[PDB]
Amino acid sequence: APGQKECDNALRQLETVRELLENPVQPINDMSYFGCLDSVMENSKVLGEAMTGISQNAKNGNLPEFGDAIATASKALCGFTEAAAQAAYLVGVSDPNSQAGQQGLVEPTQFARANQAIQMACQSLGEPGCTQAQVLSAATIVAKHTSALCNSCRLASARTANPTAKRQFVQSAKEVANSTANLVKTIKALDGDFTEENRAQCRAATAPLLEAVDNLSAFASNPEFSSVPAQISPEGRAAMEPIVISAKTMLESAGGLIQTARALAVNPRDPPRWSVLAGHSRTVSDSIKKLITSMRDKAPG
């Protein structure tokens, strides 16, 4: 039934996004404080419209439109929570006794994943039983992650005021890109003529790429480029609490809203559940109001 998958998906995404509120003492995105407030305002508006879509379409049995409203609500709830968690962090770190950290040049988790993915795709291009189709699928993985590595290198170069590091991040990226370009030549040859000799030539051309990946990993792992965690004071933690509590309350009511709506979509002849739905919806709105008020009060700058 249309709407049922959306409700289940929404409840899963809510369960995932609520984890951001458990200990929001490190930055989770690049938004400024007013960036967070802008996002809270925009997502609140979208959510308001979506809650009306949920009720009205469930009431009248417009199931595809119901599913769309559920999906829109879910997206807005996630956007809202990301903004709230970031805002909470910014409030916490703004306390005089809190110690601001510093942003690392390259985000470490996706960096490691990119390197690992390239290494495994290169290994695939090396398997004796690799089908011709698998050459092309491996190539897509190489294409994705080598381009991502180069992008990260340019970002890191922009971020650092060390002229030597600026130049080296660009050079390392060039090595990844040029070794990949050489590999691409051999991939083209192997795809055009699927011979054992061309398989060997492709395998061979993975080596300079693996070396480029390893060399960049070694360079980028310099402790001087690493992130330094924020230290949030107890006062900072107390200051961010009203934002966190309101965001948590909002998600609790939103979960109840979606669960109630899921039932009403199936059977809208249920006056008690309509009241429950209106209660959850108003409590979502109340929680958002309280969060906005708290954000205006606890603003660092």
């Binding site: 381009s147 340019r154 660009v170 990226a173 370009a181 691409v184 083209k188 795809d191």
Partner: peptide, 21 residues
């Protein structure tokens, strides 16, 4: 191979930027 070239279009864009340095 134009299809394989297309697969690496994002990398080509990165190379275009890196070449400027």
């Amino acid at each position: 191979n134009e299809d394989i070239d297309q697969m690496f279009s994002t990398l080509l864009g990165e190379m275009d930027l890196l070449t400027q340095s």
